Chain A
């Protein structure tokens, strides 16, 4: 009966994670929408390039802010891991069988 457990654990990987990734395909066209270059003249393209470059700066700043919170959590995780640790305080059979038994090793 426990080895039915391993099957269902394998199905659960084989799982929800995949569905959550898909639910991400749904998130993603909801933030980064398609470009519209058709019908923009030379000047308009120069301005767009400047607009996009400015956006690069803004998004990098937002990324930095989330990164800074992640960094502070790492420091906290490292400290708590030490605290709980304190409070709580070759050769494979295959190769071995071939060497010891020579030809007589078939099945193993």
Chain B
């Protein structure tokens, strides 16, 4: 999410205006002014693609933030930007993992953060852990670490 949101923050107004013009083609004639699998399929086929209904549903689900089953303009911008080393972080992961258990816990994160020399607030520590810990177990596993440092 975070890396895509940042890309969105950095689109110019004219870029967003052009994307709006494209979005209007997609949603032409849609009941609720949004893109369903019906509109998405129609445009993909117009473009020469032949997605299955499952691929279409998956394209929508990837960016659907309100569980509407449909794509609004904000979700469309994310879809657009989405359209366009590990060995190295594996060695670095090991350096965080001081008790060698295969997870980075809060203590280990704290130790590393203090070692940076920057002034580390409690908020710095809690938010970084929440940012890294996708499955709410309070620690950062290897796959979470890769996304965290992507």
Which residues of A approach B to under 8 Å, CB–CB? 2-3, 5, 9, 12-13, 16-17, 90-94, 96-97, 99-101, 104-108
- Complexed CA–CA distance, A107 and B10 (Å): 13
Whether the Cβ atoms of A93 and B131 lie closer than 8 Å is no
- Cβ–Cβ contact B14 & A107, under 8 A: yes
Q: Nearest 4 pairs between A and B by C-beta? A: A93-B83, A93-B80, A108-B18, A107-B14
The reply on B25 being an interface residue by CB < 8 A is: yes
Enumerate chain B interface residues (CB-CB to A < 8 A).
2, 6, 12, 14-15, 17-19, 21-22, 25, 43-44, 47, 49, 80-81, 83-85, 88, 91-92, 131, 149
Cα A97 to Cα B77 in complex, Å, equals 12
Would you give the shortest CB distance from B30 to chain A, in whole angstroms?
A: 16
Given A9-B149, A100-B22, A104-B18, A92:B83 Cβ within 8 A: yes
Query: Are A92 and B14 in contact, with the CB atoms below 8 A?
Result: no
A93 partner, pick from B43, B84, B92, beta carbons under 8 A:
B84
* CB within 8 Å for A90 and B18 given contacts A9-B149, A12-B92: no
Once the chains bind, are A108 and B15 in contact (CB under 8 Å)? yes
Measured CA separation A5–B44 after assembly (Å): 37
A99 touches B47 (CB 8 A): yes
State A90–B17 Cα separation when bound (angstroms): 23
Establish whether residues A104 and B21, one from each chain, have CB atoms under 8 Å apart when the complex forms. Answer: yes
Output the residue of A93, A99, A104, A106 with the most chain B CB within 10 A.
A93
Report Cα–Cα, A105/B19, bound state, in Å: 9
Most buried by B among A17, A93, A101, A108: A108
Flag if A13 contacts B22 (CB, 8 Å): no
**Contact partner, A17, options B44, B80, B88, Cβ 8 Å:** B88
Q: Is the CB of B12 within 8 A of A107?
A: yes
A73 shortest CB reach to chain B, Å: 15
